[PDB]
Each structure stands twice: as structure tokens, then as C-alpha cells.
């Protein structure tokens, strides 16, 4: 009768046909990852091109339904996914050239290597060679060569490729009614047509900006502690007031201080929580770790897994002849068929990784009853943030003592809590301003505020101000450091890490309140609390059928990001960092560099 | 009908007549060869004490989640557009998972069903037409598209389906008490001759 029946019947046609087509591509990917073969990788690509071709042809009728006079949120969200053209707006010459730029940038990044100036025959590749140099090796000379030469060999070559990448991408986004491809990344959290829950694209720039200033009181104190400890290892290059060198951060891109935990040990004499040996004595295995991990999900009050879940899942690498991808990855094969790929070992690192991947399944399994176009997460933060809150609570010794892995005689005090707590801030607090730094730089490059010749200059200036990091050797305009990152070269958005990190503590504080936990959040444990899982599943089941801002208002108590639950997690850490910074300077001074004279 | 080699489609649901015999309803209840079994108005163990004028068995295959639509007073794609039951339905429904029998690699396309219809069906009505569901004023001209849709679609009965999507061999046992005499009455007990 009315025009509304067209969209309702059109989406029902797509939801029936797109469903089985997508599962064929999802299922072929499972076959390839379980058995790396020339046959499976081809069927994986063939199934992918088949489904993608169906998405393109369906866009014709999707654009025949204007959504101006439509008030149905369900009709608007589903059709908007297909009405967007994306890369189809440009000719085949520009779209193919963009793929030529991306594939070339990935190969230059993957095949990157640095050779020893004292031993040219010995050269280390990106993984596992150069990653170990920045992570494990404490030699000042080796870290400088791996950092500096990487920017000269890989960073310089990716500079002219990143230019066409930004230019070609901006034309695609601008044709799709955006300001730039930076704004295109900001459209993930876009909300419109819902009173009291709208959200503009540009509001993400102010949220990461506002939350960054609230992180500075915590980050500036940790940076002084890390600079002070690294100053003792490298006193001839690090000043007590100046900045930290970029090649001493712990990685080839300056994102995490997790590898610097051995140099920033708060108390080296006190013990820590580790149930790796405890599992070996109890005759545990990959299945029992996954099985006992499910008992946590059931005890908190979340749905259990199916029989085919554990039977059809992968627990180890089935030989070299049929070598599988050992990366932890949650899979949605469809029709209620959920599985996980992982080569699980008997160790606490895999104990929490098992809970991390199981949390991803609980995300997808919740909104599995939604329509196909709406059978997805509301945003990238909601997808990955829920996985960490389940593993962090499991990492609490309260859950380990209950299951029987950690002995009850294990002594807990404020001393050992700082060993655990400060280790996380090196990962969280030592990375939060870095993501805001990189995405702010990229967002300015997409808009065009920073010219192409001023990439390295503005990038170096931003490193001294935002994070307080200085390069080991000065770089001229021919360099391009952030182009050498995996996410930047492979066309990924890194802002999801910043939003995921803050959302992790927001959901944590919401469930810690549901679990009736008092005090800081780092001592929180939601085990055996049926109210914890019940409150979460009500949010997981929403999918992308409702605004993401609504999901936060009724759970964590806000609509945008916030630093409030962060200091509650690192509450005693701020005190500990203050006493340690008595013999140092909080913050940083941009005038100092390791090559100063 | 409970163990048929092939079942008719849902929109093309078949019907078999049962009369002029003795009907043991306790064998199915105690066979434990089903996934769900529910009778409306009467217990399954008591049907042997009751004869009826006519008894029909509507056979078809539906997904696990669609089993809820088969009951008096329900609505949905299967209840309204494929196979409807009356509000005063006092029969019985048996369901048996056939994932190991009817599932096929890539889906069993022989079992299909209607998603949309110009009007809702009546109780025990069937419609196997191929008319295009018209929503707008323009004619479809025998092809779907804008405000036009092909109403029939195939099922995705694959071996990897879940409990909510696997195939289930379902049969609806309806009873009828008319003015005509009985035709099928249950088995009576017997004992030795003293």
C-alpha cells in the first residue's frame, strides 16, 4: 500500500539472501585458517567476491527509498549501509590505483628490515627480529638502529604512497557526503533521528580532546616515573626533566610501554599472580581451560555455549601439513554456529586470552536474533571493549582463588597490587595519549591542515607536546613515521583503540557496581555474581538496532567517553607515582633531546 | 507421516487422512523419537480412550525457531502466510529434528516457504501460487523489484545450522467430532479368560 512496505520487503529479501551468502564467505575463511591451502584460499576469495558483488547490485534499489520523511529507525539504519557507494563513486582507474597503493604499502611495511652497520650480512625482519630488538633487547645502540633505519628504509618509501592514499581516499569520502576520509572514520559513531541521542561526526574530535586533558594528570605522573627509571639505565642520554627518547618506548612504533615493565618494576622482591605452574600441576589442558572458562561466563549469569561450540572449535595446531592460524580469533560462521580458533597452551597468558575470545562470542551471540544488516555491533569500541572486562575480572586473584588455581595462602597487599596495577598503566596509560596523537595528526592530514611536506615536522612537534617523546636522530621532511604503522598502511582506524580503552573501564565500573564491589576497580571481581552477567547481556543484545549513546546512558552513566572510571582503576597508582616523582619532574620539557649538545 | 522419506514444502503442506483402523497414540509418546510433543485440550496418553470422526496429519518441515508459530492464536510468516491453525485447535503437534537426514551441503532447496502474501491465510488453508506480492500502485509485470517481491524462498537447511535453524520434521495431528459416526478408536486392553 504505502512506500514503507518497499523497504520492509526489500530488506527482508536482502536479509534472506545476504545471510547465506555472507556465511559462505565466513565459512570459507574458517576452512582456510584451519588448513592453509591453495584450494581454501581461492574458495575464500571466490566466496568473498561473490558476496561483495551481491552488496553492489543490491545498492540500486536501496537508493530508491529516500529516508527524509521516514521516522522508522530500523528502516533508516539498514538501508543506509547499502545506499552508501564508498569506493564505487570514483572510476576504476582511481579505485584500482588505491588498491595498488595499499598493497604496495603493506608489502613495503611487511618486508621491512634493518641491517647491522657492524655486520651487514646479519639483517633482522619486521617479525620476530626487529620486534624483539625493541621489546627484549636493552642495548641502546641496537634499539637506535632498529628505530632510525626503519624510518629511513620503510618510513621514507611510504611517504609518497601515503600521499596518494590520502588524496584518493578524500575524493571517495567527499563523494559520499563527508568532509574528508578522516570524517569518514568518525561516521562510525554517527547518530541522527533519535531525540536525546543524536551524535555528530565532529563530536569525536572534542571527546578525545576533552578526555585527553583529563588523562594528563595521570599520564604526566607515569611519564616521569618511566623517564626516571629509564634515566637510570641510560643516564648519558636521558635527562631527569626532559623527554623520553622514541626508540626506548618498547616497540617499533611507540604505542605501548608494556615491554618496559622489566625496567620499571615497582618492587622487584615481591611476588605476583601467575597460575601457569598451578595449571600444570592440576593436569589442565586447552579444553579444560576453555571449559573452566565457560564456568565463569555461566556463574556471572551469561548464556552458555553449545555442544558444537567446543566440539568443532580448534585447540592446537593440527600438524605442519595442515598448519592452521594460531591467532586468537572469534568466528561467526552463522545459523547459530559459533567457534573459536586458538592454539591454547597451559599458561596464564592463554588463560585470559581464552576469556577474551569467549567475550567476543558473547557479544555476537547476544544480538544474533537481530536482522542480518543489524546483526553487528553498534561500534568498534563495543565490539572489543567487552572482551577485556571479562579477562580482567578473571585475572583478579579472587576468581583464581575460587576456582582453586591460586593458593589461598597467597599474600595480597598494597605492595604487590602496584606491581600488577602499574604494569597495566604501561599498556593503558602509556598508550591512551598516543592514539589521540596519531589520529589527531591523521585527521588533520585528511582535512588538509598539515601540508604533505610538513608531515614529519608537525609529527615531531606533536610528539614533544602531546606525549613528550623525542626522536633519537632528527628527521627532515622526506620522512613519514606514522605511515609505517600496520593500521595506517593497511587502511584501518586506530581511534577505536582509544575508545575501546576508555569504554573498557566504563563497562567495568558499571558491572563492578552491579557486583557490589567497593574500592578501586583493579581489585574488582564479578565472579559468582548473577547480576553481573544479567546487566551486561541486556546491552549486548541491542546490536546496532539502537543508538550506542543509549546503551551507555543506562549502563555506565554517560553518552560519550569519560576518564572518571580510569582514575578509579588507577586510584592508588596515582599516589605511588607521586612519591616516586619526588626526585624528578612531572610532565616533560620539549627543549631536551638525546642528540642535544 | 512421522517417519516419511520426503516431506512436502510448508507453503505446499500435504495432508493425510486417518480413519477406519485402530490408532495407538501411546507409541509415539513413549517412543522418545521426537524433539517436541504437545497436545491441546487432551493428554497424549488419554487419546487411546477417544475416537473421532476424522483425523488428519499435516506434514511439513520447518526451522527450530519457527516451531513456536504452530499453535492456536499465533502469528508470523509461517502462521499467517504458509499454514494457519484455528484458535480452537484441540489437536496435537509432534516435532523431530532431521538435521542428520534432511540437511544438505549448501541448503536443501526442495523445502521452501512463503514470506509475504497479499492476505492472511485461513485455518487449514493452502496457497502454492507464484504471484508477485504487490505493495505499490505500479504493476510488477511478472518480476520483482521496487514495491514487488517474489513471495516464496528456499530454506537454508545446512548441516552446520544451529538448534534454531536446523530442519525439524513436524506433523500436526488434528481431530474432528462431526455428526457422522466414529471411524478410528484406540486399542482396548485385554486379559486372560477365567
GROMACS .gro file of C-alpha atoms in nm, chain A residues 1-3 5-6 8-10 12-13 16-17 19-20 23-24 27 61 64-65 333-337 339 368-369 375, chain B residues 63 77 106 109 113 115-116 133-137 144-150 153-156 158 160-163 165:
model
   58
    1UNK     CA    1   0.000   0.000   0.000
    2UNK     CA    2   0.238   0.267   0.127
    3UNK     CA    3   0.603   0.320   0.039
    5UNK     CA    4   0.629  -0.180   0.255
    6UNK     CA    5   0.900  -0.145  -0.011
    8UNK     CA    6   1.038  -0.368   0.473
    9UNK     CA    7   1.007  -0.622   0.191
   10UNK     CA    8   1.333  -0.514   0.026
   12UNK     CA    9   1.365  -0.891   0.412
   13UNK     CA   10   1.474  -1.005   0.065
   16UNK     CA   11   1.744  -1.369   0.347
   17UNK     CA   12   1.985  -1.365   0.053
   19UNK     CA   13   2.260  -1.412   0.513
   20UNK     CA   14   2.358  -1.738   0.341
   23UNK     CA   15   2.809  -1.729   0.581
   24UNK     CA   16   2.961  -1.897   0.275
   27UNK     CA   17   3.274  -2.044   0.641
   61UNK     CA   18   1.700  -0.042  -0.522
   64UNK     CA   19   1.512   0.435  -0.446
   65UNK     CA   20   1.379   0.490  -0.090
  333UNK     CA   21   3.000  -1.889   1.096
  334UNK     CA   22   2.624  -1.830   1.110
  335UNK     CA   23   2.299  -2.019   1.173
  336UNK     CA   24   2.391  -2.036   1.541
  337UNK     CA   25   2.730  -2.189   1.453
  339UNK     CA   26   3.353  -2.124   1.702
  368UNK     CA   27   2.224  -1.294   1.685
  369UNK     CA   28   1.843  -1.272   1.660
  375UNK     CA   29   2.337  -0.840   1.329
  660UNK     CA   30   1.314  -2.450   1.136
  674UNK     CA   31   0.540  -1.569   0.842
  703UNK     CA   32   2.451  -2.560   0.065
  706UNK     CA   33   1.631  -2.604  -0.172
  710UNK     CA   34   0.812  -2.136   0.223
  712UNK     CA   35   0.743  -1.489   0.339
  713UNK     CA   36   0.480  -1.238   0.220
  730UNK     CA   37   0.346  -0.951  -0.379
  731UNK     CA   38   0.233  -0.605  -0.494
  732UNK     CA   39   0.265  -0.316  -0.246
  733UNK     CA   40   0.257  -0.010  -0.473
  734UNK     CA   41   0.022   0.108  -0.745
  741UNK     CA   42   1.015  -0.835  -0.852
  742UNK     CA   43   1.181  -0.505  -0.769
  743UNK     CA   44   1.057  -0.170  -0.641
  744UNK     CA   45   0.740  -0.245  -0.439
  745UNK     CA   46   0.742  -0.601  -0.579
  746UNK     CA   47   0.876  -0.923  -0.429
  747UNK     CA   48   0.879  -1.293  -0.512
  750UNK     CA   49   1.201  -1.859  -0.079
  751UNK     CA   50   1.405  -2.169  -0.004
  752UNK     CA   51   1.526  -2.288   0.336
  753UNK     CA   52   1.889  -2.281   0.447
  755UNK     CA   53   2.268  -2.692   0.607
  757UNK     CA   54   2.612  -2.660   1.024
  758UNK     CA   55   2.283  -2.497   1.128
  759UNK     CA   56   2.202  -2.437   1.493
  760UNK     CA   57   1.907  -2.551   1.701
  762UNK     CA   58   1.781  -2.313   1.210
   0.00000   0.00000   0.00000
